């Protein structure tokens with residue numbers, strides 16, 4: 001009942017599942033002795049004894065997809081012993097988010113190039129269902145052994161049939177507006193259209209002979225919480241808890257500014273799904289941390305008017321301060337709410353003003369610039385929907401900034 005936990009080529013410790021179902025973790029002495037040792041999670045601090053808190057089960061369970069439907073698929077695909085976490089990671093824990101590599105108790109870089117036909121096949125087998133591949137030059141490949149992947153691959157997902165184009169667009173816009181986000185590309189293989197997002201939890205060495213995994217954990221993990229409480233309405237962290245947390249980042253000022261800037265950005269693009277698991281931090285040597293780039297960005301604008309949903313129904317996953325409580329409706333949110341929030345969280349008014357004024361003058365040019373990076377077959381309705389609504393909200397920044 002053990003899975004050895006590795007960080008690149010270093011043994012970190014072991015995950016054990018006792019006979020009664022309890023999960024425990026124990027760091028390896030060689031790991032702890034390193035003057036550069038870092039915990040697996042800020043919720044699992046470095047220590048010599050057996051860790052038995054719920055933070056253990058929660059940390060590892062948060063490495064898996066949230067969806068029971070996706071988990072059944074995983075058990076079926078690898079014939080996993082059960083749907084239980086320990087058993088799923090026994091099958092797919094070799095390459096996961098961050099740098100944790102889980103290998104059953106019972107290297108050289110190598111890979112296999114895939115043909116367009118083969119790539120189409122691989123992708124047609126896949127909250128949503130996502131996989132990962134290794135990019136070598138302009139070819140998509142399957143890594144061999146412990147060789148890591150470099151890109152998260154997402155398939156189309158309320159008609160969220162254009163979620164691939166939606167996210168591509170949002171990521172391009174975020175980058176154009178100065179936000180820290182991964183690059184992405186729309187890949188076409190036969191009749192499949194998927195989004196390949198470059199992973200920021202991976203890094204090639206200078207000579208390109210070794211691809212390293214970078215340790216990171218999302219906000220539920222960092223707080224020892226189960227994925228079940230990822231939404232603030234369920235007791236999960238919101239802007240206040242995360243901002244407080246970021247005070248201790250090795251890049252406090254830049255991370256708080258970036259996180260606040262991103263809240264304004266989600267509001268402008270109608271991103272209604274920015275829950276706690278959509279934020280992560282890199283865990284660095286010694287246990288210090290800093291915010292990773294932003295990810296999993298999708299606009300709810302292209303889904304408007306569909307199932308009868310109006311713009312008035314769009315709500316931010318993490319609310320802002322309101323005179324009498326919180327402000328969550330994108331359609332009712334204005335700059336005063338961001339400034340009121342900045343104030344109570346001790347985020348400088350001058351910085352909040354800069355963020356608002358920068359979007360005020362840059363949005364129109366950013367929207368035009370993004371168009372050159374869209375493929376000829378990009379769905380116009382997505383551009384139309386996001387563009388018109390972003391400009392509509394952007395007007396509110398101009399009637400003051």
Ligand SMILES: [Cl-]
Nearest residue numbers: 327328329332
């Ligand atoms: Cl509201």
